[PDB]
Each structure stands twice: as C-alpha cells, then as structure tokens.
Design a protein around this nucleic acid. Structure first.
Length: 64
DNA sequence: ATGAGACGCTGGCGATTAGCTAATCGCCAGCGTCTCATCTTTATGCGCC
C-alpha cells in the first residue's frame, strides 16, 4: 500500500541527512551506515574556512 | 461549540576480506651449407690541356 511505501520512503531520507551516517531500515532490509574509512581524498580537496550564517565563504585549494 | 504540535552509539578499534605493482637480476636470444651466375669497387703499375 501507498501509505507504508510513503513511510518507508520517509525512512530512506536519513541516508541523505546531513552529518554522520547512521543505520536505518526500509521494511525488513536493515540499511547500515556507510562510513568513510579513508581520509586521503581530503588532502587535495578544497578547504572551506568558515564564518555563523554561511554567507562569508573563504575557500582554500589544498594544493600546497 | 477541539484535540496537533516536541523522533537512535558512533567512533574507534580489531579483524576480517580483498587485492596489486614494482624493483633486481638473470637468460638468452635459429642456424648449417653448397651451387650457379651477376655486376661493381679498391691496392699497385701509364698520359698535359
């Protein structure tokens, strides 16, 4: 039914939530958390030194 | 002429689970012949505008 599928579509949003990844379920399908076990890709990413309203963005290209 | 709005351990381990070039050196390399002819070219030796 449509209602249950809506509730479980709602359940799926925690995967797209901001922040730490935590587990959840869709019906009986336990959907675990996707942890990022390697931090090598950050080393050549873009450092974002930040400000309280997110209006004043200062960006640093981590290539030095 | 009342009954909604306020939703979790995760990070830091082990310990699986999975998977990959690279640096060093050594080995070891298809080869055998003949015939036949064919042309060149070189060393030396001989001549004045």
């Amino acid at each position: 039914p449509i209602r249950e599928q809506a509730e479980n579509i709602i359940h799926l949003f925690t995967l797209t939530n901001l922040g730490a990844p935590a587990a959840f379920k869709y019906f009986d399908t336990t959907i675990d958390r996707k942890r990022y076990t390697s931090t090598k890709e950050v080393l050549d990413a873009t450092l974002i030194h930040q400000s309280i309203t997110g209006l004043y963005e200062t960006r640093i290209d981590l290539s030095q």
